[model samples]
Target: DMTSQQIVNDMKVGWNLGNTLDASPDETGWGNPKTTKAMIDKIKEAGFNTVRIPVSWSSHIGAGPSYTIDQAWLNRVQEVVNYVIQDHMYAILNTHHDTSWIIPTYNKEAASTDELTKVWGQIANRFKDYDSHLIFQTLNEPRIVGSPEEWNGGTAESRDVINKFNLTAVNTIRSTGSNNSSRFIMVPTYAASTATAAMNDLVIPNNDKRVIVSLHMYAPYSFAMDPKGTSHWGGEADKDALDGQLNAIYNKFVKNGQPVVIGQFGSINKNNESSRASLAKFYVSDARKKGITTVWWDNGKSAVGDDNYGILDRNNLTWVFPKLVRTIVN
Candidate 1:
């Protein structure tokens, strides 16, 4: 098995098949087309070496206690996993939007812990023999959704609860034995925010050296998120803000030998392709300099009024923003 750092080194760049499997009830419920082998092939051929498949298992699992996941759902997820693996790219499977079972709160710890452990145990056992190229992420942006503290750094108590949840997942996966014992695991902080409070409060499991810290950043929020905000972004202040946040992450985690993945980061389409491309270039270049790998959030919607972050046109298997794609991978 490769060290966590080497795994990070191997991942030159990554893309997210977001809003697909992660959508509730059905893969295409969120408007993105169903994933296909050719889609994964196009991503690999575009020079991306990693793919992150975010899956929402909440609707697929049974009632509590057993928390049994549907066999058909597992197989479907595996089929998608095989698509990436067959293309010779690193694949990351994560428990995306399993909010009901993995709630982020002190009072919910006991129940959440039980469900998380059970869910991960099943996932781990199912993929136990898979090679190192397949990685497991504990959860996605675990936080008290809609709470005042959700976006800001979560409260200390909430952070502590999330810490336990992450620890429980790591323990459960390791308990599965086989390759899972040493398989790489990605753990997220509260809301997966890069806020100093959240990062400072995250408790990495001791004695488990195969751990990687996962974080999401849409820095210069005005450009990356706000649909009505600034579209052009070459200003020094904008660059400083990006640099400062990533520097904090580097000094806090990467410098301490913990591999970090910018699990989701990209500017939404605002009809300014040139500016978006420039931001993409700077973001990936800076992350690479610090030994951090980033995965573009391709939600597969480029129309107005939507999040409009899609880069790859899944239906046609071509990049909507080919220049931005080139900036990201090259």
Candidate 2:
């Protein structure tokens, strides 16, 4: 298995597989396995080496903390994974929406450790035979504390808890003799937002060679979170602010010799090409200079007519910002 650094050092592009759990064409009206496979095939052809699959396994993983995932769900997940692996691309499988359950368990010191360990044991055991191309991301954004109030004050404590849980998870998985043994594991900071609480709270567990610190950047929260309207883009000033903050975070990681991955970063449904271009330029050029790898998040949502932020226009597999993607990726 290649180390996370080895993978990033080769300069590969990747994107997140979002909203696939509950998103069926019948439900929210847009997920089809065929389209997904085609999209991944396109991504592979377009030079992407990785795909982050955010699976909400709770629905299939039984009721409480003591539950195991249903065989059907596991099979479905493997089905998706096989799609990527068949294309010879790297894939990351992670627990996305399970933070609601994982958080409370972590709040209890002893229980959290045990549950964290148990969960990883199951995950590692389940995927033990997977090749090195398959990586494990411990958990998504464990924003268990929630809210700005809970975030501002004692977030550090919460972050420590999350990091500890991640450590336990890695150790548990590695002990199982799964792909985790020498395979890369992505470790998320307390909150997914790096600009918000990453540097202050992130505590990478010991000196493990296979761990990568994960952070999601969607700056000017207003633009990233806004479901409508044009993005301010924050222009140069916005870019400067983002750089300053990111520099602070990246500096520490670089100094400590830890690999970094911007797990998720993308805009909402704003029909602003210039804004998207600005973000793409800053993200790829600046971040690449610092030796960071990033993946975009797409939730199968898009604007009506013009090109939008969403990577894929699911109805027709046309790429939204095709030109901008080329320029940035170049």
Candidate 3:
């Protein structure tokens, strides 16, 4: 069982490396190997303890029946992983955007299972020597059906498959001695949403002591993503609502003695002082209580850059509402 307070300590400083893997449209993503150092430094400066690096092995893979990861791409990923680890910060590395293949594997599809296993095997082989600081997130957001049936049965089966894959990958990694036996792993529920599939059907097989249940809380997505919503810039009302929503999720994990992690959360730039400040305060309060760990999804567009949701200017990387973040994280 995971202690809630320990999780809070681990997440007191965490961030998501976004706009790199699936979040990017084509090859020109923001996760350039060279730029990784700067981001790592910035995250460290921002008072984060962990960095979740989402990688899309599919983008570079094309060997195993159109499922192979490209060698050059794999090298790039390895390079970034090294960067994160060298920073002495905890890094969660997982297959992002491979849900198309991973989900089908859950349906017991032969091809999907073969490819999924092969890819993970290759991953385990490659980083088999990395330290325990690296955590394997077997899947990203495992949605239900397609867009129309989003969060629907297909998702339940997918959750089971993800758990199976995670367990398999963990054993494989352990066998290689790359991640060591005591390495901690972050396992996400279907779609990675705390309110839906996570609360209802998340299952971590073998219930390993080092495994942690992961979730991405985006309560009232309409508000967090909406350009005009209160949380767009961090309003107090939005903050209160967000807290209530998280409280519910936390309550669920507490009941199960499962360590909870809010993988991603943050407001868009709309730059509303009240809303942004309130949200920041909410994060601080939660972190202080060691209730749940959170990683801000800085798209390099919102709340952090040129977009209304960014916290800094993209071109210059200058802080916007810098004091607000410091007040919360520090």
Q: What is the TM-score of each candidate against the true structure?
A: 0.98, 0.87, 0.83
Model 3 / residue 73 / CA error / Å: 1.8
Residue 213 shift from truth in candidate 1, angstroms? 0.5
Error of 1 at 263 (Å): 0.6
Clashing pairs for model 1 are: none
Global Cα RMSD, each model = 1.0, 3.3, 3.6
The digit string of per-residue lDDT tens for model 2 on 75-124 reads 77788888888999888888777765576333465666776776677778
lDDT of 3 by residue, 1-330 (tens): 434346445656566666665454433466322344665776677777888888877666676664666677778777777777888887888878776566534445556666766787777677767766676776677664565435542455555666676676666656666455556667777677664545666666577766777777655566556655544535577667766776777677744666767777766665466666666667757644646777766555543223334453434545566866575466
The local lDDT score (0 to 100) that residue 262 gets in candidate 1 is: 94
What are the clash counts of all predictions, listed in order?
Answer: 0, 0, 26
lDDT tens digits, residues 1-330, model 1?
579989988988999999999998989898878789999999999999999999999999998899999999999999999999999999999999888678877778899999988899999999999999999999899988788989998999889998888899999999999999889999998989988899999988774789999999987888888888887888788788888888999999899988899999988888888888888888999998999999999899887534888988899987888888999999
Report the poorest 10 consecutive residues by lDDT, candidate 1.
301-310
Which parts of model 2 are misplaced by more than 4 Å? 1-3, 22-35, 63-66, 104-107, 150-154, 195-197, 227-235, 304-309
Q: Once model 2 is optimally superposed onto the true structure by TM-score, how far is the C-alpha of residue 56 displaced, in angstroms? A: 1.1
Q: Best by lDDT, which number?
A: 1
| Candidate rank order under lDDT | 1, 2, 3
Report lDDT per candidate. Answer: 0.90, 0.70, 0.64
Model 1 residue 278 CA deviation in Å: 0.6
RMSD in angstroms between candidate 3 and the native structure over all alpha carbons: 3.6
From the highest TM-score down, the ranking of the candidates is: 1, 2, 3
Q: Is candidate 2 or candidate 3 better by lDDT?
A: 2
